[PDB]
Design an enzyme around this catalytic site. Structure first.
Site, PDB file in Angstrom:
ATOM      1  N   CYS A  27     -40.721  17.543  61.078  1.00 49.74           N
ATOM      2  CA  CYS A  27     -40.072  17.020  59.979  1.00 49.74           C
ATOM      3  C   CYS A  27     -39.658  17.612  58.700  1.00 49.74           C
ATOM      4  CB  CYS A  27     -40.920  15.733  59.939  1.00 49.74           C
ATOM      5  SG  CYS A  27     -40.289  14.146  58.918  1.00 49.74           S
TER       6      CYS A  27
ATOM      7  N   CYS B 189     -40.384  15.428  55.680  1.00 50.45           N
ATOM      8  CA  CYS B 189     -41.882  15.325  55.763  1.00 50.45           C
ATOM      9  C   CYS B 189     -42.358  16.212  54.793  1.00 50.45           C
ATOM     10  CB  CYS B 189     -42.516  14.958  56.766  1.00 50.45           C
ATOM     11  SG  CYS B 189     -41.830  13.736  57.984  1.00 50.45           S
TER      12      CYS B 189
END
Ligand SMILES: [Cu+2]
Length: 108
Positions: free
Chosen positions: A32, A35
């Site tokens: 991600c 993230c």
């Protein structure tokens, strides 16, 4: 890292729902990009908000059961918990400035 809590589906009740004080939970996953952007921002926030806030992280690819219970859709999603309840929600990657304004508004 060091003061940030690594959550599991097993421990989530004890660590978040039974915790005293505000806990900011980062629901993140592997592979991600957004993230990874906010991960050092949260290590800074953990230091700057010490005494006021605890930061905790739960990786949904290893822990598939808690996020469906909160209706999590976009990843990452940050949930601010107070006294076992969701106080505020922010989803998506954001700057250090935006996160501080979100926390300062909601820790009130
Ligand atoms: Cu540390």
């Amino acid at each position: 890292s060091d003061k940030i809590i690594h959550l599991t589906d097993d421990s989530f009740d004890t660590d978040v729902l039974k915790a005293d004080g505000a806990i900011l939970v980062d629901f993140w996953a592997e592979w991600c990009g957004p993230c990874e952007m906010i991960a050092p921002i949260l290590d800074e926030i953990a230091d700057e908000y010490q005494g006021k806030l605890t930061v905790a992280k739960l990786n949904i690819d290893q822990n598939p059961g808690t996020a469906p219970k909160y209706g999590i859709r976009g990843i990452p999603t940050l949930l601010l918990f107070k006294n076992g309840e969701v106080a505020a929600t922010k989803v998506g990657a954001l700057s250090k400035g935006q996160l501080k304004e979100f926390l300062d508004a909601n820790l009130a």
